[PDB]
């Protein structure tokens, strides 16, 4: 029964976690675009990279 | 790609056009030196000479 509860809840948890990772990856990509155009510096890019990690 | 908002883009565009207008006013205020003839025709003498 604990194995069945884990099967039932980890699909929802892992899909929420993949959406977490997709959101943080898109945030890092926008911070990289903001850096490459030239508005913010490289420290904020490294902070976004650590959040994605 | 919405890396900034649309609103501070409009704010930066406003500051760009304001600084453009300030450069335009400095340029016409420098064009008011070397005083151009407003009309075309015949000219008299110079009541105000060099150095005055």
From Swiss-Prot, chain A:
It is found in: Cell outer membrane. Disruption phenotype: Disruption of MexA, MexB and OprM significantly reduces active efflux of N-(3-oxododecanoyl) homoserine lactone/3-oxo-C12-HSL/PAI-1, but not N-butyryl homoserine lactone/C4-HSL/PAI-2. It comes from the Bacteria. Transmembrane segments: none annotated. Changing residue 38 to A: Abolishes complex formation. Induction: By growth under severe iron limitation. The outer membrane component of the MexAB-OprM efflux system that confers multidrug resistance. Functions as the major efflux pump for n-hexane and p-xylene efflux. Has been shown in one study to be involved in the active efflux of the autoinducer N-(3-oxododecanoyl) homoserine lactone, thereby playing an indirect role in quorum-sensing; but has been shown in another study not to be involved in efflux of this autoinducer. Over-expression of the pump increases antibiotic and solvent efflux capacities. Belongs to the outer membrane factor (OMF) (TC 1.B.17) family. Component of the MexAB-OprM multidrug efflux complex, composed of six MexA subunits forming a hexameric tube, binding to a MexB trimer, which interact with the trimeric OprM outer membrane channel protein. The OprM homotrimer forms a 135 Angstroms-long pore. It consists of a beta-barrel, which is probably inserted in the outer membrane, and an alpha-barrel formed by alpha-helices which probably spans the periplasm. In the ground state the periplasmic end is closed, while the outer membrane end opening is 6-8 Angstroms in diameter. This is Outer membrane protein OprM. The gene is oprM. The chain holds residues 387 to 439 of 485 of the full protein.
Curated annotation (Swiss-Prot), chain B:
Disruption phenotype: Disruption of MexA, MexB and OprM significantly reduces active efflux of N-(3-oxododecanoyl) homoserine lactone/3-oxo-C12-HSL/PAI-1, but not N-butyryl homoserine lactone/C4-HSL/PAI-2. Induction: By growth under severe iron limitation. It is found in: Cell inner membrane. Component of the MexAB-OprM multidrug efflux complex, composed of six MexA subunits forming a hexameric tube, binding to a MexB trimer, which interact with the trimeric OprM outer membrane channel protein. OprM is thought to not directly contact MexB; instead, MexA joins MexB and OprM by forming a funnel-like hexamer anchored to the inner membrane. MexA may initially form a hexameric ring complex with MexB prior to OprM, then OprM undergoes a conformational change as it contacts MexA, allowing the periplasmic gate to open. In both X-ray crystal structures approximately the last 100 residues are not ordered. The periplasmic linker component of the MexAB-OprM efflux system that confers multidrug resistance. Functions as the major efflux pump for n-hexane and p-xylene efflux. Has been shown in one study to be involved in the active efflux of the autoinducer N-(3-oxododecanoyl) homoserine lactone, thereby playing an indirect role in quorum-sensing; but has been shown in another study not to be involved in efflux of this autoinducer. Over-expression of the pump increases antibiotic and solvent efflux capacities. Implicated in the secretion of the siderophore pyoverdine. Belongs to the membrane fusion protein (MFP) (TC 8.A.1) family. This is Multidrug resistance protein MexA. The chain holds residues 126 to 177 of 383 of the full protein.
